[PDB]
Design a protein around this nucleic acid. Structure first.
Ligand code: ATP
Ligand code: CA
Ligand code: CA
Ligand code: CA
Ligand code: CA
Ligand code: CA
Ligand code: CA
Length: 901
DNA sequence: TCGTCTAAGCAGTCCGCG
DNA sequence: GCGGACTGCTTAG
């Protein structure tokens, strides 16, 4: 097999590399890598190296990496550009793996671990590590085993051995319900004392050294705790055995409000699963506890126990250990679903970077571009300092707030990456500038043609047309990968809808789910067999289809994220290729494109309808347009339609055969006007929306920019078994809105769009009457909590104190004295509830850590003093008032002359 | 929240507005 | 009470 790296580090003048050799064996080597850098040289000098602008360069070969680094400094002292890859390990990888890497994940040791630490006096601080580590569960992907290290004797209590037999039993048998599928994979090791546990753990770690290290909060908690505890007990040299090169660094992580410390283990790639999840999941969660996320992702029940976790080991050590094992397994289950480790490996090996660098699109793109240019003997420029400067973004149309009955939406495929490719926007393709007219002059095609030679953007920039820039070339490769995975995702989605339909008529039989690839549209033979299956088999197939769709979603949306982040990197001062001329060229072309096509679509539809000056495009944001189809439906007449699906087919046909060709023509003209390199503005129909045929539903409404709801029957070619609400920006979509209020507002919207005013009024009247019974957590607001210190003046709110911070300060006073009740953590999330006048807490609200029950000593008082009236008015009635006034209807029945009877 | 970008919404504080 | 200046937070792209 072809060799591939696992990890790479620079330590002084050595590169330390762990890798898989040609026989599939893990090896480690130390290499005295001699880097090269470059300087500009005179024209009359036969070199093969040229900078990205075609200027000749001479290669400088250094005796060692420190010499190269010293040379860079002196070049700054002189005031001359020092060209080339200054991150020497990336140059090492490029030289060592000069081919497309094919990796074998089965050879990469992926470790998932979690530790337990009993602490009587509050949260056990990793930097102090003053309490014994009393449990470690470490899952190894190569062995496929959970290694359990269990401390039986501690200053906080001596306990009996954990029993695998009780662990496997149902909770109704007094057991822990450790999943049967992992029972045989547990290797249990009890220990008489902490010193022997840790020494054995280090010997184990040496035998089975993680390449990828993950878990939940491992970077902020488990790793620094283990490191510091070993350091405290045994000394520094022993703690450094966590690094296969015996090198570590205490690294400070800084932001706006303060800083924290993590341990860098040289030769390990730490990918904390919480960080993978936050970057790649495209969720915003009220809480990031593993328990909360596991429930959300897997629909598993909360890991339940009595008393505080600080007394769990001594009260129920059996459960204590079982829950530690289950916690490790939960992370593996989330990854089986979301596949973020797979994603990270794919991206890391593609770019030829340290796997942990996948968190940084700037590092990722720097390496992709460097490797690309190196292939042509071209030399990358030196990174420079730039001051942060604001620059303009997308256009968003101001909608008229209203109901909108029939709506068709259209959207540009991968807009900004397509603009880059179409215009040929790249650091080395800049050709010059032209004199800019106001944007509306280009939008209305009255401005002079910018250039007869170069490819243009309406911000004044011109680009070469003779060859593709490196940015268009590399962005195209990732875009093409994204396109493939989006295809699999959408097929799985369509396949899912086939199963949902069949589930309406499940056969009374005993059978099996079909063995199929859900990434491909089901054949006619599969569709025929599906119609004969039982509900059991259909449900299992639906689960599998939805898992395939999730897998596809991860792969496609994060490739989209990467290419969109290359645009973003052009506007980030730390990117080697930062250039606000290119960043604004992209965004300004984008503004033109949307408003250009708005004009074209209006002109086309006014023509086919025989009207003048009427606005069919009701809304647009960045690269999308929303087209009122009322007049199209009214031209055939509603009475002519057999059912909802009949008018959906008609609009689908109209959009594909009439609108899209008109849109394509409009964009081809715009491409010619700007003299672009290649027409790539492809705007396809997205949603078909409207009320159910014969109903009183309003179909859709807009309240303002970035705030609307639509009843959608077909989305990007997926025809739903049941209509789906597409709600953007409204309170139902915000993590700050209480869970039960999100649910109630969504039902109000469903009724508005599908059923009408009377239905909405029935539901509102019931929610208002019953809501006081809702669980306090389900009606609590949520917020991030930054700068608690700033607003704390002797335990009381200072000037301009935010409402949620005020709640935290109330909480802090109520739990004062306790180093056992949960503390609010700076920068994390809190639940917030309003408090009625005259309460014992002495303020108008209280806040506590999100994803948790409020501590029992104040729980009863919070419950007694909760202000349900304020809660209802603020989270539910206020937003609903906004929805209903925009849609021109009433959530409460107004008086009529019929009341006389 | 270490980690690519801008546009823009709403909640809330403070305070004017005769 | 509203809304403007402002902070804070959270969305849509
Ligand atoms: N996370 C982001 N970072 C930088 N730019 C973004 C991001 N999200 C959206 N944009 C910009 O907005 C444009 C339109 O966004 P949109 O959500 O329609 O995605 P898209 O790139 O057009 O891909 P799709 O093909 O899925 O529509 C993007 O092309 C760009
Ligand atoms: Ca735990
Ligand atoms: Ca798009
Ligand atoms: Ca599309
Ligand atoms: Ca059937
Ligand atoms: Ca869009
Ligand atoms: Ca206001």
């Amino acid at each position: 097999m072809k060799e591939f790296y696992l990890t790479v580090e620079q330590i002084g003048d050595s590169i330390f590399e762990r890798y898989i050799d040609s026989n599939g064996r893990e090896r480690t080597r130390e290499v005295e890598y001699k880097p090269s850098l470059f300087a500009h040289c005179p024209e009359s000098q036969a070199t093969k190296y040229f900078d990205i602008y075609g200027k000749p360069c001479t290669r400088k070969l250094f005796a060692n990496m420190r010499d190269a680094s010293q040379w860079i400094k002196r070049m700054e002292d002189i005031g001359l550009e020092a060209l080339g890859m200054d991150d020497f390990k990336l140059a090492y990888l490029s030289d060592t793996y000069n081919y497309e890497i094919k990796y074998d994940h089965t050879k990469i040791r992926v470790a998932n671990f979690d530790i337990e630490v009993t602490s009587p006096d509050g949260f056990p601080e990793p930097s102090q590590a003053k309490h014994p580590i009393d449990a470690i569960t470490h899952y190894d992907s190569i062995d496929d085993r959970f290694y359990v290290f269990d401390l039986l004797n501690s200053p906080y209590g001596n306990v009996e051995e954990w029993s695998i037999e009780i662990a496997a039993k149902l909770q109704e048998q007094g057991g822990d319900e450790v999943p049967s599928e992992i029972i045989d994979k547990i290797i249990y090791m009890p220990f008489d004392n902490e010193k022997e546990l840790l020494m054995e753990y280090l010997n184990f770690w040496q035998q089975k050294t993680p390449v990828i290290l993950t878990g939940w909060n491992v970077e902020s908690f488990a790793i620094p705790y283990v490191y510091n505890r070993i350091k405290n007990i045994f000394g520094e040299s022993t703690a450094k055995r966590l690094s296969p090169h015996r090198k570590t660094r205490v690294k400070v992580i800084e932001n706006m409000y303060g800083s924290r410390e993590i341990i860098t283990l040289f030769g390990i790639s730490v990918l904390d699963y919480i960080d993978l999840y936050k970057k790649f999941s495209f969720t915003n969660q009220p809480s990031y506890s593993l328990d909360y996320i596991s429930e959300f992702e897997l629909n598993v029940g909360k890991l339940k126990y009595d008393g505080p976790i600080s007394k769990l080991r001594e009260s129920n050590h059996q459960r204590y250990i079982s829950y530690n094992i289950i916690a490790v397994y939960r992370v593996l289950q989330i990854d089986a679903k979301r596949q973020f480790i797979n994603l990270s490996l794919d991206m890391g090996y593609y770019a030829k970077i340290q796997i942990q660098s996948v968190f940084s699109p700037i590092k990722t793109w720097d390496a992709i571009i460097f490797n690309s240019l190196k292939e042509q003997n071209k030399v990358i420029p030196q990174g420079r300092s730039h001051p942060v400067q604001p620059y303009p973004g997308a256009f968003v149309k101001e909608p008229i707030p209203n109901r909108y009955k029939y709506v068709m939406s259209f959207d540009l495929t991968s807009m900004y990456p397509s603009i880059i490719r179409q215009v040929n926007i790249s650091p080395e393709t800049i050709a010059g500038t032209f004199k800019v007219a106001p944007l509306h002059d280009y939008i209305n095609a009255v401005a002079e043609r910018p250039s007869d030679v170069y490819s243009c953007s309406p911000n004044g920039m011109m680009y070469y047309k003779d060859r593709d820039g490196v940015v268009p070339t590399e962005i195209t490769k990732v875009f093409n990968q994204r396109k493939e995975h989006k295809g699999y995702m959408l097929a799985a989605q369509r396949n899912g809808e086939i199963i949902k339909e069949a589930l309406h008529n499940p056969n009374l039989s005993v059978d099996e789910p079909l063995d199929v690839d859900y990434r491909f549209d089901f054949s006619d033979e599969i569709k025929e067999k599906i119609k004969k299956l039982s509900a059991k088999s259909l449900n299992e197939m639906l689960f599998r289809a939805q898992r395939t769709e999730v897998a596809g979603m991860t792969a496609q949306i994060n490739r989209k994220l990467l290419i969109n982040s290359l645009y973003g990197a052009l506007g980030n001062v730390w990117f080697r290729y930062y250039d606000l001329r290119n960043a604004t060229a992209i965004t300004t072309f984008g503004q033109m494109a949307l408003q250009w096509i708005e004009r074209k679509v209006n002109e086309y539809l006014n023509e086919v309808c025989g009207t003048e000056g009427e606005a069919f495009v009701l809304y647009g944001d960045t690269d999308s347009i929303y087209v009122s189809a009322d007049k199209i439906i009214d031209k055939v007449g509603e009475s002519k339609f057999r059912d909802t699906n009949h008018w959906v087919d008609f609009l689908d046909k109209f959009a594909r055969e009439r609108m899209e060709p008109a849109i394509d023509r409009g964009f081809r003209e715009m491409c010619e006007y700007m003299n672009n390199k290649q027409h790539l503005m492809f705007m396809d129909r997205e949603a078909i929306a409207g009320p159910p045929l014969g109903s009183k539903g309003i179909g859709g409404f807009w309240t303002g920019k970035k705030r609307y709801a639509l009843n959608v029957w077909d989305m990007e070619g997926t025809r739903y078994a049941e209509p789906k609400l597409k709600i953007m920006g409204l309170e139902t979509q915000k993590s700050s809105t209480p869970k039960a209020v999100q649910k109630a507002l969504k039902e109000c919207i469903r009724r508005m769009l599908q059923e009408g005013e009377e239905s909405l009024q029935e539901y509102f009247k019931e929610f208002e009457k019953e809501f006081r019974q809702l669980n306090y957590i389900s009606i609590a607001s949520v917020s991030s909590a930054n700068n608690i210190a700033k607003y704390d003046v002797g335990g009381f709110p200072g000037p301009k104190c935010p409402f949620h911070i005020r709640g935290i300060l109330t909480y802090n006073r109520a739990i004062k004295g306790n180093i056992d009740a949960p503390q609010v953590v700076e920068g994390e999330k809190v639940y917030v509830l309003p408090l009625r006048e005259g309460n014992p807490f002495g303020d108008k609200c209280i806040a506590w850590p999100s994803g948790t029950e409020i501590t029992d000593l104040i729980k009863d008082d919070v419950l007694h003093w909760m202000d349900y009236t304020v809660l209802l008015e603020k989270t539910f009635i206020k937003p609903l008032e906004g929805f209903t006034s925009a849609a021109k209807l009433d959530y409460e029945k107004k008086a009529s002359l019929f009341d006389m009877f």
